[PDB]
């Protein structure tokens, strides 16, 4: 049924191919688990759980899952996920090839991502892995959020929240933080915290205030700083409490109104 074509991308756990669905005559994206990792029950299981979770989320700003299954190969079972094809590019790719977005475009993209997260949140689903590589922009300029994570027993870590680094509890305000990180990066060209290892970035997330975006790149404003720095507050109580509160402040800033977030001052 699915004639596989060119690879679209590589992630840490998978290869994603373009394919033609021969029945419905559409282009789909097929995510196939890396053959080496499929031998490890823990990766095989993670892959299966992620697909199931993502099939429970139907929304125009979330990449849809169409089908699941396992190919019986000479080397063994190889699981895959058939999903909505996004003809486009990730924010990671965008920052890499074109650099930071204009403030207005950044705001728009991140406000549209807030709608995917608000929808998932209200279905009791936390993304857990919000990061530039998991948000695409289509060739018609649609924002698409993908690769929602899964709840676990009690890729990169550069966008995780402080609670995640500490192994503390994780709710919608973790997504808010991580979306703040992405926003930070599409405005400035850099994630808020960088370092020569993951242990060092984790420490930064937990303990060090981010440089205000306006201090790191030209063409930004104090209002925009206020919003970004509020999503990046170390304590979830000080962040936007919902994706919708965050989007509301983004829309105010887009429209030239003062945000509700606390003022950020610099000298
Ligand atoms: N539905 C899609 N349509 C077009 N391209 C896609 C699609 N899904 C993924 N891609 C591309 O494939 C790459 C890998 O997709 P992911 O699902 O995020 O892989 P992953 O192995 O789960 O990644 P991590 O974050 O390392 S775990 C992305 O960077 C995109 O370039
Ligand atoms: Mn991913
Ligand atoms: Mn993934």
* Residue 157 beta carbon below 6 angstroms from any ligand 1 atom: no
d(CA 177, CA 263): 18
Q: For the chain, where do the domains classified as CATH 3.30.200.20 start and end?
A: 1-85
Residue 93 falls in the annotated catalytic set: no
d(CA 253, CA 221): 10
Rounded to the nearest whole angstrom, what is the distance from the C-alpha of residue 212 to the centroid of ligand 1? 30
Which segments of the chain does DSSP mark as H helices, in order?
Answer: 35-38, 41-55, 91-98, 103-122, 162-166, 172-188, 198-207, 213-216, 222-231, 243-254
Separation in Å, CA 111 to CA 5, 73, 82, 128, 176: 33, 43, 27, 18, 11
Q: For the chain, where do the domains classified as CATH 1.10.510.10 start and end?
A: 87-262
* Residue 63 beta carbon below 6 angstroms from any ligand 1 atom: yes
H-helix or E-strand containing 18? strand 14-21
* Residue 111 beta carbon below 6 angstroms from any ligand 1 atom: no
Of 36, 87, 129, 147, which residue is the catalytic one?
A: 129
d(CA 9, CA 102): 26
User: Would you tell me how many other CB atoms lie within 10 Å of the CB of residue 257?
Assistant: 11
User: Would you tell me how many other CB atoms lie within 10 Å of the CB of residue 203?
Assistant: 14
DSSP 8-state symbol, 112: H
Length of the chain: 267
d(CA 154, CA 77): 29
* Residue 21 beta carbon below 6 angstroms from any ligand 1 atom: no
d(CA 206, CA 177): 12
From the options 3.30.420.40, 2.60.120.10, 2.60.120.260, 1.10.510.10, give the CATH code of 87-262: 1.10.510.10
d(CA 234, CA 131): 18
CB 246 within 8 A of CB 231: yes
Burial 21-48 (b: 16+ CB within 10 A, else e): beeeeeebbbbbbbeeebeeeebbebbb
Q: Residue with the nearest Cα to atom 12 of ligand 1?
A: 9
CB 61 within 8 A of CB 112: yes
CB 71 within 8 A of CB 108: no
- Residue 141, judged by CB atoms within 10 A of its CB (0-12, 13-18, 19+), counts as exposed
3-state secondary structure 157-199: CCCCCHHHHHCCCCCHHHHHHHHHHHHHHHHHCCCCCCCCCHH
Rounded to the nearest whole angstrom, what is the distance from the C-alpha of residue 236 to the centroid of ligand 3? 25
DSSP 8-state symbol, 12: S
d(CA 28, CA 87): 10
The CATH T-level fold of domain 1-85 is Phosphorylase Kinase; domain 1 (3.30.200)
Residues within the annotated binding site for ATP? 8-16, 31
> Furthest-apart CA pair in the chain: how many Å?
65
CB 247 within 8 A of CB 115: yes
d(CA 8, CA 238): 39
């Amino acid at each position: 049924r699915y004639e596989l074509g060119e690879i679209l991308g590589f992630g840490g756990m998978s290869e994603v191919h373009l394919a033609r669905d021969l029945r419905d005559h559409r282009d789909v994206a097929v995510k196939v688990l890396r053959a080496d990792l499929a031998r490890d029950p823990s990766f095989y299981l993670r892959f299966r759980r992620e697909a199931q979770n993502a099939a429970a989320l139907n929304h125009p700003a979330i990449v849809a899952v169409y089908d699941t299954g396992e190919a019986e190969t000479p080397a063994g079972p190889l699981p895959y996920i058939v999903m909505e094809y996004v003809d486009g590019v990730t924010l990671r790719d965008i920052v890499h090839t074109e650099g930071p977005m204009t403030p207005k475009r950044a705001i728009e993209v991140i406000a549209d991502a807030c709608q995917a997260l608000n929808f998932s949140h209200q279905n009791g689903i936390i993304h857990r892995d919000v990061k530039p590589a998991n948000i695409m922009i289509s060739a018609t300029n649609a924002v698409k959020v993908m690769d929602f994570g899964i709840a676990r027993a009690i890729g990169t870590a550069q966008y995780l929240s402080p609670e995640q680094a500490r192994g503390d509890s994780v709710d919608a305000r973790s997504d808010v933080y991580s979306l703040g990180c992405v926003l930070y990066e599409v405005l400035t060209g850099e994630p808020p915290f960088t370092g020569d290892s993951p242990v060092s970035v984790a420490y930064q997330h937990v303990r060090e205030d981010p440089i205000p975006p306006s201090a790191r790149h030209e063409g930004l404003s104090a209002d925009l700083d206020a919003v970004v720095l509020k999503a990046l507050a170390k304590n979830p109580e000080n962040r936007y409490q919902t994706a919708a509160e965050m989007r509301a402040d983004l829309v105010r800033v887009h429209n030239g109104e003062p945000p509700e977030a606390p003022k950020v001052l610099t000298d």
